[PDB]
Protein backbone atom coordinates (compact mmCIF):
# COMPACT_ATOMS: atom_id res chain seq x y z
CA UNK A 1 0.00 0.00 0.00
CA UNK A 2 1.94 2.98 -1.34
CA UNK A 3 1.75 6.67 -0.44
CA UNK A 4 -0.33 7.50 -3.53
CA UNK A 5 -3.13 5.10 -2.58
CA UNK A 6 -3.03 6.38 1.01
CA UNK A 7 -3.26 9.99 -0.21
CA UNK A 8 -6.34 9.03 -2.23
CA UNK A 9 -7.77 7.37 0.88
CA UNK A 10 -7.06 10.60 2.78
CA UNK A 11 -8.76 12.78 0.16
CA UNK A 12 -12.05 10.86 0.13
CA UNK A 13 -12.02 10.56 3.94
CA UNK A 14 -11.49 14.33 4.19
CA UNK A 15 -14.59 14.74 1.99
CA UNK A 16 -16.64 13.24 4.84
CA UNK A 17 -16.26 16.49 6.81
CA UNK A 18 -17.63 18.43 3.81
CA UNK A 19 -20.98 16.71 3.25
CA UNK A 20 -22.86 18.43 6.09
CA UNK A 21 -21.80 21.89 4.92
CA UNK A 22 -22.77 20.76 1.41
CA UNK A 23 -26.32 19.84 2.47
CA UNK A 24 -26.66 23.28 4.08
CA UNK A 25 -25.44 24.92 0.88
CA UNK A 26 -27.80 23.00 -1.40
CA UNK A 27 -30.94 23.95 0.52
CA UNK A 28 -29.90 27.61 0.81
CA UNK A 29 -29.29 27.93 -2.94
CA UNK A 30 -32.40 26.03 -4.05
CA UNK A 31 -34.43 28.27 -1.73
CA UNK A 32 -32.72 31.36 -3.15
CA UNK A 33 -33.32 30.17 -6.71
CA UNK A 34 -36.99 29.31 -6.10
CA UNK A 35 -37.35 32.83 -4.70
CA UNK A 36 -35.63 34.40 -7.72
CA UNK A 37 -37.75 32.29 -10.10
CA UNK A 38 -40.98 33.57 -8.52
CA UNK A 39 -39.98 37.24 -8.56
CA UNK A 40 -40.40 39.25 -11.76
CA UNK A 41 -36.97 40.30 -13.10
CA UNK A 42 -34.44 39.74 -15.91
CA UNK A 43 -33.23 36.86 -13.75
CA UNK A 44 -36.51 34.98 -13.32
CA UNK A 45 -35.23 32.34 -15.73
CA UNK A 46 -32.09 31.80 -13.66
CA UNK A 47 -31.22 28.18 -12.85
CA UNK A 48 -28.37 26.32 -11.20
CA UNK A 49 -25.88 24.82 -13.65
CA UNK A 50 -24.76 21.46 -12.27
CA UNK A 51 -21.00 21.20 -12.84
CA UNK A 52 -20.27 18.29 -10.53
CA UNK A 53 -19.34 18.60 -6.88
CA UNK A 54 -16.65 15.98 -6.24
CA UNK A 55 -12.99 16.75 -5.66
CA UNK A 56 -12.23 16.09 -9.34
CA UNK A 57 -14.76 18.69 -10.54
CA UNK A 58 -14.34 21.55 -8.05
CA UNK A 59 -11.80 24.33 -7.78
CA UNK A 60 -9.26 24.21 -4.96
CA UNK A 61 -10.76 25.84 -1.88
CA UNK A 62 -11.06 25.59 1.88
CA UNK A 63 -13.39 22.88 3.23
CA UNK A 64 -16.06 25.51 4.04
CA UNK A 65 -15.81 27.26 0.65
CA UNK A 66 -18.15 26.48 -2.24
CA UNK A 67 -18.84 27.67 -5.79
CA UNK A 68 -22.09 27.46 -7.76
CA UNK A 69 -23.03 28.80 -11.19
CA UNK A 70 -26.36 30.51 -11.91
CA UNK A 71 -27.14 30.13 -15.62
CA UNK A 72 -29.38 32.59 -17.47
CA UNK A 73 -30.51 31.85 -21.02
CA UNK A 74 -29.83 34.80 -23.33
CA UNK A 75 -31.10 34.44 -26.91
CA UNK A 76 -29.61 35.81 -30.13
CA UNK A 77 -26.17 36.72 -28.82
CA UNK A 78 -23.70 38.27 -31.28
CA UNK A 79 -20.18 37.58 -30.03
CA UNK A 80 -17.16 39.72 -30.83
CA UNK A 81 -13.69 38.41 -30.04
CA UNK A 82 -11.85 40.74 -27.66
CA UNK A 83 -8.61 38.74 -27.83
CA UNK A 84 -7.50 36.88 -30.96
CA UNK A 85 -6.74 33.93 -28.66
CA UNK A 86 -10.42 33.46 -27.79
CA UNK A 87 -9.67 34.37 -24.17
CA UNK A 88 -12.31 37.12 -23.92
CA UNK A 89 -15.50 38.23 -25.63
CA UNK A 90 -17.76 41.24 -25.91
CA UNK A 91 -21.45 40.37 -25.90
CA UNK A 92 -23.60 42.13 -28.49
CA UNK A 93 -26.93 41.06 -29.95
CA UNK A 94 -28.58 40.19 -33.22
CA UNK A 95 -31.93 41.78 -34.05
CA UNK A 96 -34.57 40.88 -31.46
CA UNK A 97 -37.86 41.98 -33.06
CA UNK A 98 -39.95 41.82 -29.86
CA UNK A 99 -37.28 43.67 -27.84
CA UNK A 100 -34.09 42.65 -26.04
CA UNK A 101 -35.09 41.83 -22.43
CA UNK A 102 -31.56 42.84 -21.35
CA UNK A 103 -31.76 46.20 -23.20
CA UNK A 104 -31.19 48.20 -20.00
CA UNK A 105 -27.94 46.39 -19.16
CA UNK A 106 -26.37 47.62 -22.42
CA UNK A 107 -23.52 50.12 -22.67
CA UNK A 108 -23.46 51.12 -26.31
CA UNK A 109 -23.64 47.96 -28.42
CA UNK A 110 -22.23 45.77 -25.63
CA UNK A 111 -23.82 43.97 -22.68
CA UNK A 112 -22.33 45.45 -19.50
CA UNK A 113 -21.31 42.81 -16.98
CA UNK A 114 -21.09 45.66 -14.46
CA UNK A 115 -24.72 46.73 -14.91
CA UNK A 116 -26.00 43.15 -14.99
CA UNK A 117 -24.04 42.03 -11.92
CA UNK A 118 -25.03 45.08 -9.86
CA UNK A 119 -28.71 44.22 -10.22
CA UNK A 120 -27.90 40.51 -9.86
CA UNK A 121 -26.26 41.37 -6.53
CA UNK A 122 -29.12 43.66 -5.48
CA UNK A 123 -31.93 41.17 -6.08
CA UNK A 124 -30.09 38.38 -4.22
CA UNK A 125 -29.42 40.66 -1.21
CA UNK A 126 -33.17 41.33 -1.08
CA UNK A 127 -34.20 37.67 -1.39
CA UNK A 128 -31.47 36.61 1.06
CA UNK A 129 -32.83 39.14 3.56
CA UNK A 130 -36.12 37.19 3.45
CA UNK A 131 -34.77 33.77 4.46
CA UNK A 132 -35.29 33.23 8.18
CA UNK A 133 -34.90 29.43 8.69
CA UNK A 134 -31.18 29.96 8.28
CA UNK A 135 -28.71 32.82 8.84
CA UNK A 136 -27.70 33.83 5.32
CA UNK A 137 -26.22 37.20 4.36
CA UNK A 138 -24.20 38.46 1.40
CA UNK A 139 -20.55 39.44 1.73
CA UNK A 140 -19.66 42.94 0.61
CA UNK A 141 -18.59 43.10 -3.02
CA UNK A 142 -14.89 42.41 -3.48
CA UNK A 143 -12.50 44.18 -5.84
CA UNK A 144 -11.81 41.96 -8.79
CA UNK A 145 -14.09 38.95 -8.47
CA UNK A 146 -17.62 39.20 -9.93
CA UNK A 147 -18.89 36.64 -7.42
CA UNK A 148 -21.97 37.25 -5.29
CA UNK A 149 -20.78 35.28 -2.26
CA UNK A 150 -23.24 34.16 0.40
CA UNK A 151 -22.17 33.95 4.03
CA UNK A 152 -24.04 31.04 5.68
CA UNK A 153 -23.65 31.23 9.49
CA UNK A 154 -25.41 27.96 10.45
CA UNK A 155 -23.03 27.65 13.45
CA UNK A 156 -19.86 27.40 11.26
CA UNK A 157 -19.48 30.18 8.64
CA UNK A 158 -19.81 28.67 5.11
CA UNK A 159 -18.98 30.71 1.97
CA UNK A 160 -20.72 30.25 -1.39
CA UNK A 161 -19.58 32.18 -4.48
CA UNK A 162 -22.50 32.57 -6.91
CA UNK A 163 -21.29 32.99 -10.50
CA UNK A 164 -23.62 34.42 -13.14
CA UNK A 165 -23.29 32.69 -16.51
CA UNK A 166 -25.07 33.55 -19.72
CA UNK A 167 -26.38 30.52 -21.61
CA UNK A 168 -26.34 30.74 -25.41
CA UNK A 169 -27.92 28.03 -27.55
CA UNK A 170 -26.24 29.27 -30.72
CA UNK A 171 -23.29 27.62 -32.39
CA UNK A 172 -19.99 27.39 -30.55
CA UNK A 173 -17.54 30.25 -31.14
CA UNK A 174 -15.21 30.01 -34.14
CA UNK A 175 -12.35 29.81 -31.63
CA UNK A 176 -13.52 26.30 -30.60
CA UNK A 177 -13.69 24.88 -34.15
CA UNK A 178 -10.56 22.74 -33.76
CA UNK A 179 -10.97 22.35 -29.99
CA UNK A 180 -12.31 19.38 -28.05
CA UNK A 181 -10.03 16.90 -29.90
CA UNK A 182 -11.68 13.72 -28.62
CA UNK A 183 -12.06 11.95 -31.99
CA UNK A 184 -9.70 9.08 -31.16
CA UNK A 185 -10.86 8.76 -27.54
CA UNK A 186 -14.57 9.50 -27.00
CA UNK A 187 -15.31 9.63 -30.73
CA UNK A 188 -16.94 11.69 -33.44
CA UNK A 189 -20.53 11.00 -32.38
CA UNK A 190 -19.83 12.20 -28.84
CA UNK A 191 -17.98 15.27 -30.13
CA UNK A 192 -20.86 16.17 -32.46
CA UNK A 193 -23.37 15.82 -29.62
CA UNK A 194 -21.34 17.85 -27.12
CA UNK A 195 -20.89 20.70 -29.60
CA UNK A 196 -24.68 20.79 -30.05
CA UNK A 197 -25.20 21.63 -26.36
CA UNK A 198 -25.18 25.26 -25.17
CA UNK A 199 -22.10 27.16 -24.06
CA UNK A 200 -21.70 29.70 -21.30
CA UNK A 201 -20.28 33.18 -20.76
CA UNK A 202 -18.82 34.14 -17.37
CA UNK A 203 -17.98 37.79 -16.64
CA UNK A 204 -14.26 38.34 -16.20
CA UNK A 205 -12.16 41.48 -16.52
CA UNK A 206 -8.93 41.44 -18.49
CA UNK A 207 -5.73 42.96 -17.11
CA UNK A 208 -5.14 45.41 -19.93
CA UNK A 209 -6.47 48.92 -19.23
CA UNK A 210 -9.67 50.87 -18.75
CA UNK A 211 -11.36 50.17 -22.10
CA UNK A 212 -14.14 47.54 -22.02
CA UNK A 213 -13.44 46.82 -18.33
CA UNK A 214 -16.61 45.39 -16.83
CA UNK A 215 -17.80 44.56 -20.36
CA UNK A 216 -15.70 41.44 -21.06
CA UNK A 217 -16.75 37.79 -20.81
CA UNK A 218 -14.93 34.46 -21.04
CA UNK A 219 -16.22 31.13 -22.28
CA UNK A 220 -17.17 28.35 -19.88
CA UNK A 221 -17.67 24.68 -20.77
CA UNK A 222 -18.12 23.43 -17.20
CA UNK A 223 -21.13 21.36 -18.28
CA UNK A 224 -19.02 19.70 -20.99
CA UNK A 225 -16.09 19.21 -18.61
CA UNK A 226 -18.36 17.45 -16.11
CA UNK A 227 -19.64 15.11 -18.83
CA UNK A 228 -16.11 14.26 -19.97
CA UNK A 229 -14.96 13.62 -16.40
CA UNK A 230 -17.93 11.30 -15.87
CA UNK A 231 -17.74 9.63 -19.32
CA UNK A 232 -13.97 9.41 -19.63
CA UNK A 233 -13.44 5.93 -21.09
CA UNK A 234 -12.92 4.42 -24.53
CA UNK A 235 -15.27 1.63 -23.44
CA UNK A 236 -18.76 2.66 -22.43
CA UNK A 237 -18.52 0.48 -19.29
CA UNK A 238 -15.31 2.09 -18.00
CA UNK A 239 -15.64 2.40 -14.20
CA UNK A 240 -19.17 0.94 -14.35
CA UNK A 241 -20.46 -2.05 -12.39
CA UNK A 242 -20.22 -4.42 -15.39
CA UNK A 243 -16.95 -2.86 -16.52
CA UNK A 244 -13.38 -2.20 -15.40
CA UNK A 245 -12.16 0.78 -13.42
CA UNK A 246 -9.33 3.04 -14.52
CA UNK A 247 -7.16 5.49 -12.59
CA UNK A 248 -8.00 8.57 -14.68
CA UNK A 249 -9.91 10.41 -11.95
CA UNK A 250 -7.43 9.23 -9.32
CA UNK A 251 -4.60 10.79 -11.32
CA UNK A 252 -6.53 14.06 -11.63
CA UNK A 253 -7.14 14.09 -7.87
CA UNK A 254 -3.50 13.40 -6.95
CA UNK A 255 -2.39 16.18 -9.31
CA UNK A 256 -4.90 18.71 -8.03
CA UNK A 257 -3.88 17.83 -4.47
CA UNK A 258 -0.17 18.15 -5.28
CA UNK A 259 -0.73 21.64 -6.69
CA UNK A 260 -3.00 22.71 -3.82
CA UNK A 261 -0.52 21.71 -1.11
CA UNK A 262 2.30 23.34 -3.08
CA UNK A 263 0.22 26.51 -3.49
CA UNK A 264 -0.56 26.86 0.22
CA UNK A 265 3.20 26.96 0.90
CA UNK A 266 4.43 29.24 -1.91
CA UNK A 267 2.86 32.53 -2.95
CA UNK A 268 5.07 32.09 -6.03
CA UNK A 269 2.45 29.63 -7.31
CA UNK A 270 -0.46 32.10 -7.24
CA UNK A 271 -0.83 32.19 -11.03
CA UNK A 272 -1.42 28.41 -11.15
CA UNK A 273 -4.84 26.90 -10.47
CA UNK A 274 -6.61 23.55 -10.71
CA UNK A 275 -7.90 24.37 -14.20
CA UNK A 276 -4.35 24.10 -15.55
CA UNK A 277 -4.27 20.59 -14.07
CA UNK A 278 -7.59 19.59 -15.63
CA UNK A 279 -6.51 21.00 -19.00
CA UNK A 280 -3.23 19.07 -18.88
CA UNK A 281 -4.94 15.78 -18.07
CA UNK A 282 -7.54 16.36 -20.79
CA UNK A 283 -4.61 16.34 -23.22
CA UNK A 284 -3.10 13.23 -21.61
CA UNK A 285 -6.45 11.47 -22.01
CA UNK A 286 -6.41 12.39 -25.71
CA UNK A 287 -2.78 11.30 -26.19
CA UNK A 288 -3.20 7.99 -24.28
CA UNK A 289 -6.84 7.10 -25.03
CA UNK A 290 -6.95 3.36 -24.19
CA UNK A 291 -8.49 2.38 -20.84
CA UNK A 292 -5.57 -0.06 -20.45
CA UNK A 293 -3.25 2.98 -20.50
CA UNK A 294 -4.93 4.03 -17.22
CA UNK A 295 -5.00 0.67 -15.46
CA UNK A 296 -5.42 1.07 -11.67
CA UNK A 297 -2.54 -1.31 -11.02
CA UNK A 298 -0.23 1.22 -12.74
CA UNK A 299 -1.32 4.25 -10.67
CA UNK A 300 2.19 5.50 -9.88
CA UNK A 301 3.35 5.09 -13.49
CA UNK A 302 0.24 6.91 -14.71
CA UNK A 303 0.67 9.67 -12.14
CA UNK A 304 4.33 10.01 -13.12
CA UNK A 305 3.64 10.37 -16.84
CA UNK A 306 1.02 13.00 -16.02
CA UNK A 307 3.74 14.78 -14.05
CA UNK A 308 6.25 14.47 -16.89
CA UNK A 309 3.65 15.88 -19.28
CA UNK A 310 2.88 18.83 -16.99
CA UNK A 311 6.61 19.44 -16.60
CA UNK A 312 6.97 19.55 -20.38
CA UNK A 313 4.08 22.01 -20.61
CA UNK A 314 5.92 24.24 -18.13
CA UNK A 315 9.28 23.92 -19.88
CA UNK A 316 7.85 24.82 -23.30
CA UNK A 317 5.42 27.35 -21.74
CA UNK A 318 2.54 25.90 -23.72
CA UNK A 319 -0.75 24.54 -22.40
CA UNK A 320 -3.49 24.94 -24.99
CA UNK A 321 -7.00 25.40 -23.66
CA UNK A 322 -8.72 22.11 -24.42
CA UNK A 323 -11.66 23.88 -26.08
CA UNK A 324 -9.88 26.93 -27.57
CA UNK A 325 -6.56 25.78 -29.09
CA UNK A 326 -5.21 29.31 -29.72
CA UNK A 327 -5.61 30.23 -26.02
CA UNK A 328 -2.29 29.37 -24.35
CA UNK A 329 -2.84 29.21 -20.59
CA UNK A 330 0.95 29.05 -20.08
CA UNK A 331 1.83 32.14 -22.14
CA UNK A 332 4.21 34.67 -20.61
CA UNK A 333 1.51 37.36 -20.71
CA UNK A 334 -0.41 35.31 -18.14
CA UNK A 335 2.35 33.59 -16.12
CA UNK A 336 5.92 34.84 -15.75
CA UNK A 337 8.53 32.35 -16.95
CA UNK A 338 10.04 32.42 -13.45
CA UNK A 339 6.83 31.10 -11.87
CA UNK A 340 6.90 28.11 -14.23
CA UNK A 341 10.55 27.38 -13.46
CA UNK A 342 9.78 27.66 -9.74
CA UNK A 343 6.85 25.25 -10.02
CA UNK A 344 8.96 22.89 -12.16
CA UNK A 345 11.68 22.72 -9.51
CA UNK A 346 9.04 22.17 -6.81
CA UNK A 347 7.50 19.27 -8.75
CA UNK A 348 10.82 17.63 -9.63
CA UNK A 349 11.75 17.87 -5.95
CA UNK A 350 8.50 16.21 -4.88
CA UNK A 351 8.81 13.64 -7.67
CA UNK A 352 12.35 12.55 -6.77
CA UNK A 353 11.71 12.42 -3.00
CA UNK A 354 8.52 10.37 -2.60
CA UNK A 355 6.29 13.47 -2.41
CA UNK A 356 7.04 14.80 1.11
CA UNK A 357 4.32 17.43 0.59
CA UNK A 358 1.79 14.58 0.81
CA UNK A 359 2.65 13.76 4.44
CA UNK A 360 1.19 16.89 6.07
ZN1 LIG B 1 -12.82 4.76 -15.79
Swiss-Prot record:
Q: Give binding positions for Zn(2+).
A: 232, 238-239, 246
One record GO biological process: regulation of immunoglobulin production
At which residues is PolyADP-ribosyl glutamic acid found? 30
> Which effect does the record note for changing residue 52 to A?
Abolishes stimulation of interferon production
Q: What is the effect of changing residue 274 to A?
A: Decreased cyclic GMP-AMP synthase activity
- GO CC annotations on file: cytosol; nuclear body; nucleus; plasma membrane; site of double-strand break
For this UniProt record, give its keywords in alphabetical order, as a comma-separated list. Acetylation, ADP-ribosylation, Antiviral defense, ATP-binding, Cell membrane, Chromosome, Cytoplasm, DNA damage, DNA repair, DNA-binding, GTP-binding, Immunity, Innate immunity, Isopeptide bond, Lipid-binding, Lipoprotein, Magnesium, Membrane, Metal-binding, Methylation, Nucleotide-binding, Nucleotidyltransferase, Nucleus, Palmitate, Phosphoprotein, Transferase, Ubl conjugation, Zinc
Q: What is the effect of changing residue 236 to E?
A: Slightly decreased interaction with nucleosomes
- Tell me the residues linked by Glycyl lysine isopeptide (Lys-Gly) (interchain with G-Cter in SUMO): 71, 189, 226, 236, 318
Q: Which residues participate in GTP binding?
A: 51, 161, 218-225
Asked if Metal-binding is a keyword of the record, the answer is yes
Sites of 5-glutamyl glutamate modification: 156
Please outline how this chain is modified post-translation: The N-terminal disordered part (1-146) is phosphorylated by AURKB during the G2-M transition, blocking CGAS liquid phase separation and preventing activation. Phosphorylation at Tyr-55 by BLK promotes cytosolic retention. Localizes into the nucleus following dephosphorylation at Tyr-55. Phosphorylation at Ser-274 activates the nucleotidyltransferase activity. Dephosphorylation at Ser-274 by PPP6C impairs its ability to bind GTP, thereby inactivating it.
Q: Which cofactor does it need?
A: Mg(2+); Mn(2+); Zn(2+)
Q: What is its main location?
A: nucleus
Q: Reported effect of changing residue 196 to E? A: Strongly decreased interaction with nucleosomes
**Cross-link Glycyl lysine isopeptide (Lys-Gly) (interchain with G-Cter in ubiquitin): residue positions:** 125, 189, 226, 253, 256, 263-264, 318
| Modification type Phosphotyrosine: residues | 55
**Top-level enzyme category:** transferase
List of residues that carry N6-acetyllysine: 226, 236, 256
Q: Which reaction does it catalyse?
A: GTP + ATP = 2',3'-cGAMP + 2 diphosphate; GTP + ATP = pppGp(2'-5')A + diphosphate; pppGp(2'-5')A = 2',3'-cGAMP + diphosphate
Cofactor: record remark: Binds 1 Mg(2+) per subunit. Is also active with Mn(2+). Mn(2+)-activated enzyme forms an inverted pppGp(2'-5')A intermediate, suggesting a non-canonical but accelerated 2',3'-cGAMP cyclization without substrate flip-over. Mn(2+) ions are coordinated by triphosphate moiety of the inverted substrate, independent of the catalytic triad residues.
Q: What job does this protein perform?
A: Nucleotidyltransferase that catalyzes the formation of cyclic GMP-AMP (2',3'-cGAMP) from ATP and GTP and plays a key role in innate immunity. Catalysis involves both the formation of a 2',5' phosphodiester linkage at the GpA step and the formation of a 3',5' phosphodiester linkage at the ApG step, producing c[G(2',5')pA(3',5')p].
Q: Which family is it part of?
A: Belongs to the mab-21 family.
Assembly and partners are described as: Monomer in the absence of DNA. Homodimer in presence of dsDNA: forms a 2:2 dimer with two enzymes binding to two DNA molecules. Interacts with nucleosomes; interaction is mainly mediated via histones H2A and H2B and inactivates the nucleotidyltransferase activity by blocking DNA-binding and subsequent activation. Interacts with PQBP1 (via WW domain). Interacts with TRIM14; this interaction recruits USP14, leading to deubiquitinate and stabilize CGAS and promote type I interferon production. Interacts with ZCCHC3; promoting sensing of dsDNA by CGAS.
Name used for this protein in its record: Cyclic GMP-AMP synthase
> What is the organism of origin for this protein?
Mus musculus
> What is the gene called?
Cgas
